[PDB]
Structure 1
Amino acid sequence: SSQGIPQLVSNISACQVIAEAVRTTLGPRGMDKLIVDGRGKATISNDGATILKLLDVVHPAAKTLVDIAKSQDAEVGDGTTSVTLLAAEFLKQVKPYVEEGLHPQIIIRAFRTATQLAVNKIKEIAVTVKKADKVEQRKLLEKCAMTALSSKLISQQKAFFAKMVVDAVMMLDDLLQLKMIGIKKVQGGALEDSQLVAGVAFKKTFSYAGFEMQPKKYHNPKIALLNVELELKAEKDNAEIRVHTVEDYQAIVDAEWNILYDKLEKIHHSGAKVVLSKLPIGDVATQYFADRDMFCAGRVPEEDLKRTMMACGGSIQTSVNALSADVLGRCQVFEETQIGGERYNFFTGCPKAKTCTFILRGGAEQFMEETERSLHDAIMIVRRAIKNDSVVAGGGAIEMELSKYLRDYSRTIPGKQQLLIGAYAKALEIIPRQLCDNAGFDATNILNKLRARHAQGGTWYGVDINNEDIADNFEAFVWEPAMVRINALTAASEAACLIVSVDETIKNP
């Protein structure tokens, strides 16, 4: 490397390379990437935030871009791809100009003024319908989620999916990581029907006889949060006893199990009245728990424990300790409903209803995975939108609105900054271009008519991935929050200006 342009163009190339790790994953139907861990584990994730989190980045320019991407992930999470692509394309479109030899401080202040103007234009052109109280607006959020889900192309049950997810998120759910409000998918059954779980519970119970006669509908069960288990062959006593009678050998078989029997008796008498365990439990143990007039769930996932933390208000027990009801959580609903073939046990209704998860049953596998991503995206967008002051038309539209506005302002501003603002505006075109390319590779053909009709008159028109044709991205209920878009554009601008402000990289090994 060398001072000034020769190292800055290397930074340009590095930012292009780190873009290539995200370039094709922008759209919701964009290409997914398999990333292999050094342990030999194959992981699949089509969202740029997770990709960059798993991907190790070494080059300092890529390091800064990924750091800004992670800050945006902490901000929203989906904006990682957008901010990375904007930074990379800003750098790409200043590459011919910086290689020409103009000082990068010029483009620093050029981007600064351009993005301040862009923020002004966003705040001016953003519009609000909000007013979510009335039923019309409830079904407006419903049709928004429907447009997000449109890959399913189902009949009215499409709107039912949307209504269920919007209701689950609107019931007392604040802006959060959303991990507790997740979904599950089940084989068989009709996709027209599924369970609106009022909480979260265990995936599929076992074939034990205690399951069939399990005590459905606990009125207010106190819960026990265990991890240590009782099971066969796990432990034994190496005792030796000389014969005295025939009644004596039962001391050995007693010592093999007596501590376990007392342990289960006391931990069930602790004050809890339903018990969960992360490790497998024996059927014989289940029968003694039925002797305790009680039931146990083994092999529970750790996410069950975390959702119990944030929703059930419980606390970990993890062993026979804590023989008290004080540290135990509470539930308002419990049952078991074999969802088709899914032997799902239910314990739901919590001091905090932050999780009111859903379980899908549609008799397939290929649809409900992209369905998981689609519902994830829709339930995310509604909650981020309601918090923000205003919303703006997304999906490649507002990028073109800003591009047209900045082209018009660049072509009228004097001084060498106008070429730079024009380059900024052309670089801002990348999101429509990548949305089109990742969808049908017809980017130019649709982009030309899109820009032309956008310049024809004031509209929020953009690209529609559903039909590869221009659609009213606003009033087609595909949206991006205005405040989130300000955050994304400003973060991308700061990343780009910071990384193009640097001439040398310094090493002291």
Structure 2
Amino acid sequence: VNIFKAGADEERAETARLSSFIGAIAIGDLVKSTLGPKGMDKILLSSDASLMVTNDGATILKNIGVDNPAAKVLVDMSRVQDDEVGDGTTSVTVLAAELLREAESLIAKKIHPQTIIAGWREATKAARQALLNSAVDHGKFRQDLMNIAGTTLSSKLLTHHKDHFTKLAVEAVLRLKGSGNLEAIHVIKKLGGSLADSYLDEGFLLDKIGVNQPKRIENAKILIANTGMDTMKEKVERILKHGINCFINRQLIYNYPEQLFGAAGVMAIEHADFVGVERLALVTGGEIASTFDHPELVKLGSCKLIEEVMIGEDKLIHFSGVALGEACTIVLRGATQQILDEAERSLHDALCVLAQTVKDSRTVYGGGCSEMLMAHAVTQLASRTPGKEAVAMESYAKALRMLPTIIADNAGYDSADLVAQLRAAHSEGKTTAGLDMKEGTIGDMSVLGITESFQVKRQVLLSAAEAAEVILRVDNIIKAA
């Protein structure tokens, strides 16, 4: 006469659903504060007494000890939305939550979950087709590229120098634009100076190990080596039999082998960062070899210029002019440590969106403009498809209006008035009606150069929707006390 040991909760009926959805909702509304270029970062603290001040939702959700199954789902979403583009990370999370909160609402209305999912399924797909009619199609116009990069770098700490990084991120995507290749762009984060001192090296960069070794070797056949040159003379000899002028050792090179290198005119560099050793095999073509008894004349990469310049009083080995110049290395310099690290990723993502422009030539309008259009689209459609499907599709649209609503809240500008101002002015100004926080009023998105990348929104709508559906299909889970 007892199915679960003393202490085994049993979520039944609504309680089960109420608990499930809310859990995700809380996590969704949490990072919600960090919305728009005017949010509120959170000072997270792990178990090692660490102060983490970030505005990026993903990172925030990765440091929070999530003790809820449903929530963990959001951690995934934010982990995907962030590894694909960048911003909007908060969006996808928040939105997904509100849906569930709207779900538990219809449930209280005696509306079976399934029909709810059906409604959202229609609404979502319906809203998708819509984002197409509004999605403006662009096409090497270094102007729009800047507008897209400048909108990705914003809403962050780089917003101060976003203009500087825009030219860099765009300059690299226009040079290495053969089919959108972000694998040919190396990021060099170094401390020493402000963020306005960062540049874009037209080649691979990896910040010698001998004053007798040739510093600047014009034509050098880079030979990558993993293992170190220590137990020595046979090491330098074999390497000399392959005919190399530039030796790159990941590990440490002994003193003796180091002497034979400089005496033989073979510039070497020990202790090479693995990340810097991996790209080298993709920038110059030098195949990485294990022991010195494995490499030959086929493990030699072609480099047209390997010099060492004391940039900012720092010795930087330039491998510029590689066989396939379709590879560079944007150098970032930050005064502190978080600034440099926060800028790095900021560029990484900036490179992603650009990778979407080089393939996905579809762009949208942010500032809650896109959503408000959806909200108005799915609505008219809801009235077309009767049955519980209606209220569902309807509640879906109203849930999409929250995007700009929150964009106005974190602005100090009343949202209740914005929703009406935006929604009404959207039915008159077409899809070119978006919110402008910096003016505290609705403005034209295309006239202000505020445009997001299709991929962004599309992913969100498709993500949250379907995902939530499953979350609404569960009504009895076994977690922890």
* TM-score bucket (shorter structure): 0.7 to 0.9
Aligned in 2, Cα 1:446/1:373: closer, same or farther, shift over 3 Å? farther
SS, match of residue 92 in structure 1: helix
1:198 aligns with 2:176: no
Per the TM alignment, residue 88 of structure 1 is displaced from its structure 2 partner at its CA by 0.4
Per the TM alignment, residue 89 of structure 1 is displaced from its structure 2 partner at its CA by 0.8
Aligned in 2, Cα 1:161/1:320: closer, same or farther, shift over 3 Å? same
1:113 aligns with 2:122: yes
SS, match of residue 238 in structure 2: helix
Query: For residues 281-296 of structure 1, what are the structure 2 equivalents within 5 Å?
Result: 281=253, 286-296=258-268
Bigger shift: 33-42 or 354-363? 33-42
Q: Tell me if the contact between 2:408 and 2:414 (Cα under 8 Å) persists in the aligned partners.
A: yes
1:246 alignment counterpart: none
Per the TM alignment, residue 91 of structure 1 is displaced from its structure 2 partner at its CA by 0.9
1:342 alignment counterpart: 314
1:219 alignment counterpart: 219
Which of 123, 130, 133 does residue 132 from structure 2 map onto?
123
Bigger shift: 326-335 or 30-39? 30-39
1:298 alignment counterpart: 270
Distance 1:71 1:262 in 2: 49
Which of 441, 466, 481 does residue 494 from structure 1 map onto?
466
Aligned in 2, Cα 1:209/1:322: closer, same or farther, shift over 3 Å? same
SS, match of residue 196 in structure 1: strand
Q: Tell me if the contact between 1:406 and 1:425 (Cα under 8 Å) persists in the aligned partners.
A: yes
Q: Deviations over 1:164-200 (max 9, x none)?
A: 4212112335446658442434524894x76531232
Aligned in 2, Cα 1:468/1:267: closer, same or farther, shift over 3 Å? farther
Q: Deviations over 1:9-44 (max 9, x none)?
A: 111112123325633444466555566677888777
Q: Tell me if the contact between 1:197 and 1:358 (Cα under 8 Å) persists in the aligned partners.
A: yes
Per the TM alignment, residue 432 of structure 1 is displaced from its structure 2 partner at its CA by 2.4
1:166 aligns with 2:137: no
Per the TM alignment, residue 325 of structure 1 is displaced from its structure 2 partner at its CA by 2.1
1:82 alignment counterpart: 91
Aligned in 2, Cα 1:197/1:483: closer, same or farther, shift over 3 Å? closer
Distance 1:414 1:286 in 2: 80
Distance 1:189 1:318 in 2: 39
Q: Give aligned pairs, total.
A: 467
2:28 alignment counterpart: 19
1:504 aligns with 2:476: yes
Query: For residues 39-438 of structure 1, what are the structure 2 equivalents within 5 Å?
Result: 46-52=55-61, 57-70=66-79, 72=81, 76=85, 78=87, 80-130=89-139, 132=140, 137-149=141-153, 161-173=165-177, 174-175=179-180, 180-188=185-193, 191=196, 195-203=199-207, 209-210=211-212, 214-228=214-228, 230=230, 260-281=232-253, 286-353=258-325, 355-361=327-333, 371-410=343-382, 414-437=386-409
If the length of structure 2 is used for normalisation, what is the TM-score?
Answer: 0.81
SS, match of residue 462 in structure 1: strand
Q: Tell me if the contact between 1:446 and 1:469 (Cα under 8 Å) persists in the aligned partners.
A: no
Tell me the amino acid that sits aligned with residue 196 of structure 1.
L
**Structure 1 residue runs without a partner (length 5+):** 231-258
Tell me the amino acid that sits aligned with residue 225 of structure 1.
A
1:444 aligns with 2:444: no
Bigger shift: 327-336 or 101-110? 327-336
Distance 2:272 2:382 in 1: 60
SS, match of residue 116 in structure 1: helix
Tell me the amino acid that sits aligned with residue 14 of structure 2.
I
SS, match of residue 303 in structure 1: helix
2:5 alignment counterpart: none
Q: How big is the alpha-carbon RMSD for the aligned residues of Structure 1 and Structure 2?
A: 3.8
Tell me the amino acid that sits aligned with residue 184 of structure 1.
K
1:249 alignment counterpart: none
Distance 2:70 2:159 in 1: 42
Query: For residues 473-484 of structure 1, what are the structure 2 equivalents within 5 Å?
Result: 473-484=445-456
SS, match of residue 333 in structure 1: coil
Identity of aligned residues (%): 32
Q: Deviations over 1:450-498 (max 9, x none)?
A: 3443244314332346565544333433322324422320121101111
Tell me the amino acid that sits aligned with residue 215 of structure 2.
P
Q: Tell me if the contact between 1:49 and 1:78 (Cα under 8 Å) persists in the aligned partners.
A: no
Q: Deviations over 1:106-156 (max 9, x none)?
A: 2111111211221121112212122x3xxxx123323433454567678xx
Distance 1:358 1:475 in 2: 31
Per the TM alignment, residue 401 of structure 1 is displaced from its structure 2 partner at its CA by 1.5
Aligned in 2, Cα 1:201/1:357: closer, same or farther, shift over 3 Å? closer
Tell me the amino acid that sits aligned with residue 296 of structure 1.
A
SS, match of residue 357 in structure 1: strand
Distance 1:383 1:181 in 2: 15
Q: Over alpha carbons, which structure has the higher Rg?
A: 1
Bigger shift: 468-477 or 108-117? 468-477
